[PDB]
């Protein structure tokens, strides 16, 4: 279902924005990061084996951005701020991916 | 059996990762590799219906979740607390003894 892919991918995008936009000292950070990683794992596990999705810009861009977020947290733990230039890049990839997503791309 | 093969590999990575000293330069890679194997195992078998009735699956799932929850809360260099690490390793042995017998 394409509508379901749009709903699920929008939710993940919102979680990335929520997690990345918290204050670096914020106490909810560890919880936010944990929820994001659970959302990311579910999204990947649901959609990565769907072959044709690799042809969607929305999928490639979200998959790449989630990997950028995941790689940072698995290296440094949940309260390490993502480097500012990567954070900017990730949030920009979220915007480009969401613009494709809601056009059915 | 594919499930036995995959679960043995995960057990082995848990044992390898938990046994490393905190000075080991491979710890970061080892935790990452374990996280990846753990994700692939759960994604592959949590969907399978029959397996939640298997002791090996429940015990592995539980122990991977204990490993996961620790490393999502701390960096890869933070050791799992000693008493939990020992319990995890013991559940690995229990799970493997059931796994090898088809349970």
Numbering used by the authors:
A (entry chain B): 2 to 106
B (entry chain A): 4 to 106
From the study:
In this study, we resolved the crystal structure of AtPsb27 at a resolution of 1.85 Å, which is the first Psb27 structure from higher plants. To determine the structure of Psb27 from A. thaliana, its mature form (AtPsb27) was successfully over-expressed as a GST-AtPsb27 fusion protein in E. coli. AtPsb27 crystalized at a concentration of 22 mg/ml in 2.0M potassium/sodium phosphate solution at pH 7.0, and the crystals of AtPsb27 were observed after 3 days. The AtPsb27 structure reveals as a helix bundle with a relatively flat top and bottom, consisting of four long alpha helices (H1–H4) as well as a small helix between H2 and H3, designated as H*. The four alpha helices, H1–H4, span residues 3–22, 30–49, 58–76, and 85–104, respectively, and are arranged in an up-down-up-down anti-parallel fold to form the bundle body. The loops H1–H2 and H3–H4 are located on the top of the structure. The well-conserved P-Φ-P motif (where Φ is I, L, or V) resides in the loop H3–H4, and is exposed to the AtPsb27 surface. The small helix H* is formed by residues 52–56, and constitutes the bottom area of the AtPsb27 structure. Firstly, H1 and H4 are positioned more closely in AtPsb27 than they are in TePsb27, which makes the AtPsb27 bundle tighter than in TePsb27. In contrast, the N-terminal region of AtPsb27 consists of a stretch of negatively charged residues, which makes it unlikely for AtPsb27 to bind the membrane through its N terminus.
